[PDB]
């Protein structure tokens, strides 16, 4: 479905059996979620942002449903202010920008 | 016209007579550019993101051309790692996020 940007592009996601809201972020290479319980093993990593860097856990092959569209990919979990869906997942659900 | 997200959504902008590259970022409420020369007066302000926060200069009624489309809006200038075009300007070039 088409989505304008007059408001934050928030969508509902289901991951690790839980429902959360997340921001569709074309400026994000990667998907980063607030602290949550996810199964499987992880590996440390640091991602950067406008205010600096944060440490996060990296999980691969994680299944996520974004607005009904399923995707599998890497998901980072750490002290991010908000749940962000990055391009690594955006491409899986066919998102595009139109102007 | 339209752009996919397999790569960072970089666009060319002209602002303050200068050509720069910027990221179209649907996750950004505001537009923030790396340090540059921009005429006019400004007002202090602080914005946040992943990693912490940065102090920026706020310029209003700034003309910017994004990939050919003109827009006038507020532009923040400060220590950001990359030039970001946020929703405040994205809506002006009829940027929509469809999936």
């Amino acid at each position: 479905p088409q989505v304008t940007l007059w408001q934050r592009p928030l969508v509902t996601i289901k991951i690790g059996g839980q429902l959360k809201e997340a921001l569709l972020d074309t400026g994000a290479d990667d998907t980063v979620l607030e602290e949550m319980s996810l199964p499987g093993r992880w590996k440390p990593k640091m991602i950067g942002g406008i205010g600096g860097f944060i440490k996060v856990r990296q999980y691969d092959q994680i299944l996520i449903e974004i607005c009904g569209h399923k995707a599998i990919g890497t998901v980072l979990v750490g002290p991010t202010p908000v749940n962000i869906i990055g391009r690594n997942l955006l491409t899986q659900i066919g998102m595009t920008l139109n102007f | 016209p339209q752009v996919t997200l397999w790569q960072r959504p970089l666009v060319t902008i002209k602002i303050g007579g200068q050509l720069k590259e910027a990221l179209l970022d649907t996750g950004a409420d505001d537009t923030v550019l790396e340090e540059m020369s921009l005429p006019g007066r400004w007002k202090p302000k602080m914005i946040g993101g992943i990693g912490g926060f940065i102090k920026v200069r706020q310029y209003d009624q700034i003309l910017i051309e994004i990939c050919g489309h003109k827009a006038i809006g507020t532009v923040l200038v400060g220590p950001t790692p990359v030039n970001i075009i946020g929703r405040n300007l994205l809506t002006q070039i009829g940027m929509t996020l469809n999936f």
Partner: peptide, 5 residues
């Protein structure tokens, strides 16, 4: 903005 770096 998220930078995988």
């Amino acid at each position: 903005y998220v930078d995988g770096a």
